[PDB]
Amino acid sequence: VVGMGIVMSLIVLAIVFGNVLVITAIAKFERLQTVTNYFITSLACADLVMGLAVVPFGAAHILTKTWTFGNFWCEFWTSIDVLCVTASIETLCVIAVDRYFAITSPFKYQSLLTKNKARVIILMVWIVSGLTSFLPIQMHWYRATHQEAINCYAEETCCDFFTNQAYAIASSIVSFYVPLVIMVFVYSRVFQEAKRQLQKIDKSEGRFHHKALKTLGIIMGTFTLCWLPFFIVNIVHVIQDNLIRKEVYILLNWIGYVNSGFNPLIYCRSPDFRIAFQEL
Amino acid sequence: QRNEEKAQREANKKIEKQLQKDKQVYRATHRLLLLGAGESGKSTIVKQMGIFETKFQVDKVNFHMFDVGGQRDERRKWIQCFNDVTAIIFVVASSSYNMVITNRLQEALNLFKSIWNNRWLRTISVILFLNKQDLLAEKVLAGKSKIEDYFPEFARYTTPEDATPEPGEDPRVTRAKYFIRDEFLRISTASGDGRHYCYPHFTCAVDTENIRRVFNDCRDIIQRMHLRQYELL
Amino acid sequence: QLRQEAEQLKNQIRDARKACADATLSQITNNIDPVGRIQMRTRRTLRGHLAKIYAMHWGTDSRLLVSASQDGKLIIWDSYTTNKVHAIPLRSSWVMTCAYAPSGNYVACGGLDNICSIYNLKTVRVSRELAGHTGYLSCCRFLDDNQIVTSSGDTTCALWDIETGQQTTTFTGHTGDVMSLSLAPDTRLFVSGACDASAKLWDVREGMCRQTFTGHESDINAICFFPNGNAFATGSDDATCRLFDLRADQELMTYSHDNIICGITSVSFSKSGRLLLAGYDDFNCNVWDALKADRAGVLAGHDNRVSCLGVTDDGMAVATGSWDSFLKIWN
Amino acid sequence: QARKLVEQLKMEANIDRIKVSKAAADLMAYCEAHAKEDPLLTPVPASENPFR
Ligand SMILES: Nc1nc2c(ncn2[C@@H]2O[C@H](COP(=O)(O)OP(=O)(O)OP(=O)(O)O)[C@@H](O)[C@H]2O)c(=O)[nH]1
Ligand SMILES: CN[C@@H]1CCc2c(ccc(O)c2O)[C@H]1O
């Protein structure tokens, strides 16, 4: 337990530093303010909120093995967890669809995406995440019914997660399983277009004269490896009881959290962004 | 007092609204620059489809062409203004290898090399039209003139394996056409690396497929730019 | 025959120039106190242009100014409150210069259409079109309410009559494109720098060339009179500036640095004639010392190449324009 | 065309020229005399600055 605090103190610092740097670099310089960069700001805001108001309280609760903040703060913390996770995941699908539209139809891309439409889309995404998280949890439509659930809800010092079979399925479907297929289809089409363009170039100037695969592999693999096992066990532990332990659940959930710190290292590797970072 | 301030604010609001309205029209049009050597056929190719500008629409897309013919200086100090165009159209008469006017193709090649290697024009692609195909075929069929007299390297040149000659093409006319196209592509490929490319076409004065060719080339140009921006290409 | 006589005359001129160089400006100004450190901060930023900017001219009242952009617009600002006053749409989208009349009644324009156009502000509509040049316009300046001097790319300059649209006189002698000009304070002479690395001192009343200076090594992009009227400065694309004297008829000082390799797009003096502000291709502006040739400040608030630069008549502010479609007022 | 150039050089050859020291002294005197009324040289108080 001595080194656990040391290792968990670095995650908060990394998340906060990366997201603060990204937000400050976007806000300070006018040349970086485009339509595409609006979604990155929302993703950074969600990751920053997760790094600030989620990781420290969870780490303290794990270390002390007791929730010393009554019963209101446990529910508020759970609502914030769900809200931040959903709002972070949906922005990746938004960005993927944006790139799909930008590459597949280049003539109509300028007219399709505007500042007002981007703002409307971001507001809709955040509203949907809030409806998924805050509305059911605070209205007590997610609690379970077994004796252990009642006992843990009664205790003020105990704050554990118990849900009914329908809520887990609905939340997993809304948060993870719907964006995944959309992103897979989008990136398949993008890879096809890139391959076609490369073939045309080679057929044109082949006599005188890998990147897409690596980029797509990074983008898909990071997200899938970070968030896939948790949303499998989230249904496994309700379908088949007495099959999933608590420590495994916590470990997979925390593996999911650290994906919020890797985001600035994937969506902000641009010469303009690097120059902006250097100027700071 | 505030009486002048209110009128100033109203005028500023009206001007800003007009500018916002005009920005949408400005951002959804494509500008093209038309260049060519002397007697190459710029006027004939533009009529079929200080300064001269034409506007045409294909597939509900707005296009806007320019033809700078008012200035005929050997140097081009006005070439730095056209550093934000979609593409450049270069027209050359490929059937003028025996006109002294160094012959004409040498001057055209030098002009193409100078345009390609320019500080401001380092991210603009070129659509290349090799005009006057029928005259080139007629010259090749006749034995009066030989290309090796003016271009010695043609003697050791051989037709590339990847070719698409039409049924009416003789083995010699195809060889000459591909020799000239390769002569241009050799200069094209050496200088740039991924930033901008060249699109060569064989054109005469009776075909009416040039608008489709420009449309497809511009679509490819924008698609490649977007692919390269995201590091997918 | 004639060529030998021309060479002999050139040698005689060169020998005559060398006999009058008793001392140097750098030697005389050794004991004067240095200007020190000068720092300028942006006060206003103007937005509204959809494309890059080439031209800008201050008003006589030191409050209004005009600007021209590639999108085909001509906007008049109010630097005190940042309020757009006018927006004139242009027939041709390729504009390269603009000017603002001394009385504020009219504004001129020109570009790649080989035509100079005058607009009546206090009537906005086109008032007169001047044609006859066979090359793109590079500059235009108002002598008074009824006269204007223009230069074009056909190696000639002309003096126009707006009322009738006729060239009163024409100036010839350059072997390259004329790139800029500037009028004397009393409006009796003017200078023009061309693309053959030479500048000449013309006479408006007579119509003849009086002096020629050939100190540079490449194209000349900018020119500006000293406030006194007995000197001027030029800026070429070889990253050098030079100060010429009319009476001594030779170069006095050179403003160059070893860390600058980019070209110069515009120059301008100050109210007292002590500072010299020059814009460069490396996205920033440098401030020199006229009597020392020592750099004394840098203005680095732009994100693209600086194309124009101007100082107000009262010497209260400096305006700059760039290719990112933004103007900035420094103080 | 050569005759015109010869005439131009002949006209330009006969011009009086003054000492470089005199011109430098005149420029220095003008700069020194008009140094007080230069808002860009000596910064102006913020009371009389219309841009701030
Ligand atoms: N026989 C034949 N002549 C052609 C063909 N294409 C172009 N031409 C020549 O083109 C000429 C028509 O004038 P343009 O092609 O516009 O030449 P231009 O007006 O001088 O154009 P620029 O030199 O670029 O300014 C005719 O006299 C033809 O000789 C062709 O396919 N067949
Ligand atoms: C306690 N951590 C929570 C538990 C369940 C859950 C999470 C995230 C998104 C969801 O849709 C969920 O249902 C996890 O972050």
Measured between alpha carbons, how far is A49 from A55 in angstroms, rounded to an integer? 10
Q: In this structure, how many other beta carbons lie within 10 angstroms of the beta carbon of residue A241? A: 8
CB atoms within 10 A of CB C57: 21
**In angstroms, rounded to a whole number, what is the distance separating the alpha carbons of residues A65 and B165?**
80
* Selection from A58, A44, A125, A50 nearest residue A80 by Cα: A50
Terminal Cα distance for chain B, rounded: 60
A and B touch with 3+ CB pairs <8 Å, answer yes
Give the bridge partners for B127, in sequence order: B89, B199
List of chain B residues whose C-beta atoms are within 8 Å of the C-beta of residue C114: 50, 70
Which residues lie below 8 Å from residue A213, measured CB to CB, with a gap of 6+? A191
Q: Measuring CA to CA, which residue among C329, C220, C323 is closest to residue C266?
A: C220
Give CA–CA dist B211/C313, Å, rounded: 53
> For B8, left (φ over 0), alpha (ψ -120 to 50), or beta?
alpha
- C53 in Cβ contact with C69 (< 8 Å): yes
Task: Write the CA distances from B168 to B134, B161, B171, B172, B203, integer angstroms.
Answer: 12, 18, 10, 12, 15
Q: Closest ligand 2 atom to the C-alpha of A174?
A: 11
State how far the alpha carbon of C89 is from the alpha carbons of A123, B18, B22, B25, C72, in Å: 38, 11, 11, 14, 6
Question: How far is it, in rounded angstroms, from Cα C171 to Cα C156?
Answer: 6
Q: Is C85 on the interface with D (CB under 8 A)?
A: no
Euclidean distance between CA atoms D8 and D11, whole angstroms: 5
Helices (H), chain B: 2-27, 42-48, 104-116, 133-141, 147-150, 171-191, 210-229
| DSSP H helix total and E strand total for chain D | 2, 0
Q: How far is C75 from chain B (nearest CA, A)?
A: 10
Is B19 touching C (CB cutoff 8 A)?
yes
CB C223 within 8 A of CB C267: yes
Which of C2, C16, C329 is opposite residue D2, by nearest beta carbon? Answer: C2
Element spanning A90, H or E: helix A72-104
Backbone φ, ψ for residue C62 (5° rounding) = 65, 25
- Per CB-CB distance under 8 Å, the chain C contacts of B19 are 48, 50, 87
CA–CA separation, B59 and B50 (whole Å): 30
Contact B185 A201 (CB under 8 A): no
Q: Which long-range contacts (CB under 8 A, 24 or more apart) does C87-93 make?
A: C87/B15, C87/B18, C87/B19, C88/C119, C88/C124, C90/C117, C91/C117, C92/B50, C92/B51
Q: Return the C-alpha torsion angle A36, A39, A43, A48, nearest 10.
A: 90
Instruction: Identify all chain B residues contacting A198, using CB atoms and an 8 Å cutoff.
Output: 233
Q: Which CATH architecture has domain D1-51?
A: Irregular (4.10)
On whether any CB of chain B is under 8 Å from the CB of A122, the answer is: no
User: CA-to-CA distance for B76 and B92, rounded, in angstroms?
Assistant: 18
Three-class DSSP category at C95:
strand
Q: Pick the residue whose CA is nearest to atom 6 on ligand 2.
A: A82
Rounded distance from Cα B52 to ligand 1 centre (Å) = 18
In this structure, is residue A197 part of a structural domain?
Answer: no
* DSSP secondary structure code for residue A98 in this structure: H
In C112-208 the beta strands, taken as DSSP E runs, fall at: 116-120, 125-130, 137-144, 147-152, 157-161, 166-171, 178-183, 189-194, 199-203
Asked whether the beta carbons of residue B22 and residue C153 sit closer than 8 angstroms, the reply is no
- Please state the atom number of ligand 1 nearest to the C-alpha of residue B39: 23
Phi, psi for C256 (deg, rounded to 5): -135, 155
Q: Which residues contact B83 (CB under 8 A, 6 or more apart)?
A: B120, B121, B124
Technique used by the depositors? cryo-EM
B102 Cβ inside 6 Å of ligand 1? no
- CA dist., res. B144 & res. B128, Å (int): 28
Domain-wise residue ranges, chain B = 1-233
Domain ranges of chain D: 1-51
Task: For the domain made up of C45-330, give the CATH fold.
Answer: Methylamine Dehydrogenase; Chain H (2.130.10)
Q: Which residue has the tokens 């060529």?
A: C3
Does A224 carry a binding-site annotation?
no
- Pairing label, strands C116-120, C327-330: unpaired
Return the H-helix or E-strand segment holding C27: helix C25-28
Instruction: Look at residue C308 and give its three-state secondary structure.
Output: strand
CB C139 within 8 A of CB C180: yes
Q: Closest ligand 1 atom to the C-alpha of B38? A: 23
Reported resolution, Å: 3.2
Q: How is residue C122 written in tokens?
A: 């206090």
Chain B neighbours, 3+ Cβ pairs < 8 A = A, C
Neighbours of C1 (CB within 10 A): 7
Residues with Cβ within 8 Å of B175's Cβ and at least 6 positions away in sequence, in order, are B157, B158, B159
Q: Tell me, what DSSP letter sits at residue A93?
A: H
CA distance B64 to B26: 11
**Quick one: which of A69, A65, A52 has its CA closest to A246?**
A65
Phi and psi at residue B168, to the nearest 5°: -80, -10
CB of A259 shorter than 6 A to ligand 2: no
User: Is B70 within 8 Å of C112 when comparing Cβ atoms?
Assistant: yes
Domain that residue A168 falls in? 2-175+260-279
How big is the CA angle at D46 (ends D41 and D49), to the nearest 5 degrees? Answer: 70
Residues of C in contact with B85 (CB under 8 A): none
Q: Are C293 and C255 in contact (CB under 8 A)?
A: yes
Helix H or strand E encompassing C58: strand C53-58
**Residue located via tokens 């994937």:** A266
Return the CATH architecture of domain B1-233. 3-Layer(aba) Sandwich (3.40)
Q: Is A85 in the pocket of ligand 2 (CB under 6 A)?
A: yes
CB contacts, 8 Å: B186 with chain A: 208
Residues 201-220 of A with CB under 8 A from B: 201, 203-209, 211-212, 215-216
DSSP annotation of C216:
-
Q: Which residue of B has its CA nearest to C113?
A: B50
Q: Could you tell me which chain C residue has the CA closest to the CA of B13? A: C84
CB A133 less than 6 A from any atom of ligand 2: no
- Tally the domains of chain A: 1
Q: Which residue has the tokens 């000239």?
A: B180
Specify if A227 maps to a domain.
no
Structural domain includes residue A101: yes
The edge-to-edge listing of strands for the beta sheet with C327-330 is C42-46, C327-330, C318-322, C306-311
How far, in Å, is the centroid of ligand 2 from the Cα of A82? 5
Residue of C184, C323, C198 whose CA lies nearest to C265: C323
Q: Fill in the amino acid letter for A117.
A: K
Atom of ligand 1 minimally distant from the CA of B206: 31
Q: What would the two tokens of residue C249 be?
A: 């008829």
- Measured distance CA(C185)–CA(D47) in Å, rounded: 31
The amino acid occupying position A220 is: M
Residues B123/B127/B128/B132 CA torsion (nearest 10 deg): -160
Looking at ligand 1, which residue's alpha carbon is closest to its atom 9?
B41
The helix/strand count (H/E) of chain A reads as 13, 0
Tell me, yes or no, whether A140 lies in a domain.
yes
- Cα–Cα distance list, B124 to B116, B192, B227, C213 (Å): 9, 11, 16, 38
* Helix (H) or strand (E) segment spanning residue B199: strand B198-202
Helix (H) or strand (E) holding D24: helix D20-33
A70: domain CATH number?
A: 1.20.1070.10
Decide if A83 is inside a domain: yes
Count Cα neighbours of A187 within 13 Å in the Cβ-side half-sphere.
Answer: 23
Residue C106 contacts residue C116 (beta carbons within 8 Å): no
Task: Give the long-range contacts of residues A262-269, CB within 8 A, separation 24 or more.
Answer: A262/A222, A262/A226, A263/A18, A263/A19, A263/A43, A263/A44, A263/A47, A264/A18, A264/A19, A264/A21, A264/A22, A264/A44, A265/A18, A266/A218, A266/A219, A266/A222, A267/A40, A267/A43, A267/A95, A268/A22, A268/A40
Cβ atoms C2, D2 nearer than 8 A: yes
